[PDB]
Amino acid sequence: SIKIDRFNNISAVNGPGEEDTWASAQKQGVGTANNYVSKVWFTLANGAISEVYYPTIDTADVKEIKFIVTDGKSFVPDETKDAISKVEKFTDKSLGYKLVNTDKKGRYRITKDIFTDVKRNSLIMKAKFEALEGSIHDYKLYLAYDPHIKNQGSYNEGYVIKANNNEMLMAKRDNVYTALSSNIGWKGYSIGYYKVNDIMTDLDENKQMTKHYDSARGNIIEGAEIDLTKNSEFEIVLSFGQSDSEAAKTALETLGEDYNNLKNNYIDEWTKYCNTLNNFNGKANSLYYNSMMILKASEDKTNKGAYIASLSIPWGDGQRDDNTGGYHLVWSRDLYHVANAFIAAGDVDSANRSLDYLAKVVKDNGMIPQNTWISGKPYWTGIQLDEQADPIILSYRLKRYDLYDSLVKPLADFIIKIGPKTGQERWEEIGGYSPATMAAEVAGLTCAAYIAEQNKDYESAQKYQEKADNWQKLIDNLTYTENGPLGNGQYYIRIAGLSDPDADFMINIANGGGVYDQKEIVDPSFLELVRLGVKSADDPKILNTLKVVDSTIKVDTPKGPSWYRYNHDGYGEPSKTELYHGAGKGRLWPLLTGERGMYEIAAGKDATPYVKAMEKFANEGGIISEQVWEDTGLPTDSASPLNWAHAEYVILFASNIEHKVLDMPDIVYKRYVA
Numbered sequence: 001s002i003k004i005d006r007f008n009n010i011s012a013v014n015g016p017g018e019e020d021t022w023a024s025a026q027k028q029g030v031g032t033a034n035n036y037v038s039k040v041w042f043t044l045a046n047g048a049i050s051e052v053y054y055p056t057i058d059t060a061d062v063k064e065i066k067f068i069v070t071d072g073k074s075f076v077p078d079e080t081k082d083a084i085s086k087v088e089k090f091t092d093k094s095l096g097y098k099l100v101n102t103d104k105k106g107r108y109r110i111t112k113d114i115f116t117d118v119k120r121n122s123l124i125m126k127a128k129f130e131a132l133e134g135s136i137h138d139y140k141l142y143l144a145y146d147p148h149i150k151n152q153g154s155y156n157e158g159y160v161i162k163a164n165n166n167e168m169l170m171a172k173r174d175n176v177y178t179a180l181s182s183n184i185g186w187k188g189y190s191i192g193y194y195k196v197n198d199i200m201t202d203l204d205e206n207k208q209m210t211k212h213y214d215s216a217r218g219n220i221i222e223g224a225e226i227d228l229t230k231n232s233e234f235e236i237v238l239s240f241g242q243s244d245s246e247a248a249k250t251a252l253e254t255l256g257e258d259y260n261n262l263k264n265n266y267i268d269e270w271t272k273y274c275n276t277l278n279n280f281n282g283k284a285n286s287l288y289y290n291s292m293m294i295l296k297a298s299e300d301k302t303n304k305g306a307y308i309a310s311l312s313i314p315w316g317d318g319q320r321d322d323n324t325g326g327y328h329l330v331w332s333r334d335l336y337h338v339a340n341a342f343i344a345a346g347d348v349d350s351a352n353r354s355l356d357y358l359a360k361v362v363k364d365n366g367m368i369p370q371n372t373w374i375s376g377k378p379y380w381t382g383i384q385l386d387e388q389a390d391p392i393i394l395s396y397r398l399k400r401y402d403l404y405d406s407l408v409k410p411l412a413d414f415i416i417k418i419g420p421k422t423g424q425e426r427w428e429e430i431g432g433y434s435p436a437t438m439a440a441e442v443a444g445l446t447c448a449a450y451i452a453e454q455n456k457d458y459e460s461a462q463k464y465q466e467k468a469d470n471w472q473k474l475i476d477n478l479t480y481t482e483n484g485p486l487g488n489g490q491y492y493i494r495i496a497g498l499s500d501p502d503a504d505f506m507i508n509i510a511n512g513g514g515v516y517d518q519k520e521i522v523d524p525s526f527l528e529l530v531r532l533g534v535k536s537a538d539d540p541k542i543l544n545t546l547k548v549v550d551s552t553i554k555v556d557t558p559k560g561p562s563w564y565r566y567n568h569d570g571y572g573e574p575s576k577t578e579l580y581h582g583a584g585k586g587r588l589w590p591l592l593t594g595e596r597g598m599y600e601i602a603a604g605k606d607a608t609p610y611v612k613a614m615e616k617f618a619n620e621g622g623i624i625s626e627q628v629w630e631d632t633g634l635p636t637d638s639a640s641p642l643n644w645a646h647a648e649y650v651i652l653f654a655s656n657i658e659h660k661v662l663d664m665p666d667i668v669y670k671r672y673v674a
């Protein structure tokens with residue numbers, strides 16, 4: 001098809017380069033074409049493109065793609081740390097992004113347009129450089145591509161080719177190839193070793209490109225100078241392929257297309273999807289649409305239904321670039337909630353697609369594993385009973401009684417075989433009797449019985465409901481303490497280590513949280529009892545727990561109220577200037593703000609302030625993180641966007657309008673709470 005010419009004139013020296021890391025998990029935006037053809041996902045952080053995925057949503061191939069500007073004399077500022085970035089989407093109904101990075105010293109201004117090719121596997125970035133002060137002739141612009149092909153930064157192979165007289169910077173590892181090209185070509189290129197002789201180091205030592213290596217292997221950085229005199233506004237394209245030819249050809253095809261045409265096609269495809277969702281009598285707002293799009297963009301395009309928790313690697317800029325699943329893995333719990341958001345938005349198709357994925361997972365593993373790669377292969381192996389129950393609950397709500405033999409029955413039988421105690425509760429750290437987990441188990445088994453009757457399996461139905469009723473009746477006896485050290489000493493505890501919530505029992509908190517008596521730990525997750533319809537919102541035991549929870553783990557931030565997952569949580573940054581590396585201090589979860597909002601609705605109260613609080617917790621790109629700081633309410637370096645938190649916002653937003661808990665299974669509610 002095309003003519004490619006590979007050359008090796010000068011090989012980078014002093015390899016293999018320094019160890020690298022992943023990008024900051026705080027994202028300004030994320031996106032992908034709304035079709036299964038273009039298997040490319042991108043994320044933005046610190047004013048630049050961060051991780052890029054291909055060919056699957058759990059395969060990150062890039063760390064960064066940023067600009068370095070210099071006067072070729074004194075300064076060398078990195079836009080990702082020396083410029084203020086402002087982000088905005090092309091429109092309220094498209095995951096296209098416009099970044100405007102203005103030098104902290106007001107010397108330059110870089111504006112970018114980022115999105116993908118709806119027809120091919122390539123990422124597009126239109127950029128224009130502006131000299132705020134002085135002449136554009138006094139500045140040099142350099143692009144720095146940091147590849148981490150197939151989930152690893154080490155041993156990346158870099159070289160340069162020319163496809164149809166087009167100099168493209170190539171990067172490869174195993175079967176994944178990337179091609180970096182410019183619509184106006186490169187004024188100069190080089191493939192050096194990270195922190196050794198890469199573009200960044202070269203510029204810090206010469207204030208201008210000195211090395212011009214065209215080959216390297218290891219932790220590499222593909223640098224290239226942009227010819228400003230030729231054009232201050234250019235187009236950069238990053239293409240993927242299973243070979244040099246494919247990748248390079250894809251880059252040529254995208255570049256040969258009309259920019260505005262590709263941009264509009266990308267925007268329209270997303271606008272079409274948005275306009276397919278409920279707008280709640282014109283009430284639907286930008287965050288609603290932003291959330292739903294983000295959820296839609298979190299599905300793998302090969303293994304449909306596989307929705308990941310988050311398209312980021314938490315505290316990634318603090319972890320070695322080794323192969324990690326980060327949060328781009330599939331959790332039955334998170335998917336369940338994401339499915340409910342789709343349901344509430346009107347996109348029942350996505351929800352069903354996710355349910356079928358779970359069916360697949362169950363078929364391959366005989367049960368629901370803690371979490372799995374999109375392939376369905378288990379990542380971690382803890383035994384979470386709520387994750388065994390959620391897919392059953394979803395089956396009921398989607399009225400997919402056809403999945404009884406392959407999904408419901410096997411999961412229900414499993415649950416009855418090991419329940420009600422769980423290997424670990426929803427925070428994935430400790431086992432025992434958890435009110436949140438038991439709530440899910442009772443709701444799950446109730447749903448299982450309903451589906452069993454639909455399949456005329458009255459025997460199983462009876463067996464399922466009896467177990468559900470028995471466990472429903474034991475919740476208080478197993479998890480409600482009346483001998484607690486907090487408040488009036490009466491409340492649901494986070495988790496009972498044994499069949500006696502009043503007894504003394506020491507538990508070990510994860511992430512270095514310490515050791516405490518079970519009765520000392522409270523968790524807002526108890527609200528799952530009312531959320532699932534297992535307990536009434538006005539149940540005095542619920543009200544009593546609420547008092548203790550708000551007295552011990554509620555924080556009113558300048559953005560609104562939020563809660564900790566539980567007292568002594570250590571899953572977070574240890575300090576304002578340190579990243580999480582296994583042990584720190586858990587922070588506030590906007591996810592829990594929404595959950596409280598949903599409880600308030602069940603209690604017949606206005607949840608508007610909770611809706612507003614979540615909106616304020618969102619960053620400039622309308623993205624909600626897993627955790628926020630107590631003092632400012634701003635995002636931490638935890639995962640973002642946290643799809644579960646976005647799903648919660650959608651359901652809360654809609655529920656606050658409809659004045660009812662939209663995701664509560666009526667069958668359970670009418671049997672235990674009504």
Ligand SMILES: C[C@H]1O[C@H](O[C@H]2[C@H](O)[C@@H](O)[C@@H](O[C@H]3[C@H](O)[C@@H](O)[C@@H](O)O[C@@H]3CO)O[C@@H]2CO)[C@H](O)[C@@H](O)[C@@H]1N[C@H]1C=C(CO)[C@@H](O)[C@H](O)[C@H]1O
Pocket residue numbers: 309310327331333334380382426427428429510511571644
């Ligand atoms: C994502 C998850 O991260 C935390 O839990 C995991 C630890 O970080 C891992 O290191 C591993 O922990 C093991 C220890 O390293 C080992 O020394 C021993 O103590 O056993 C540990 C358990 O295997 O695995 C942990 C997962 O079990 C964090 O504590 C946990 O809360 C985090 N889960 C959240 C993320 C999602 C996805 O959006 C949701 O499903 C959960 O509800 C969240 O709580």
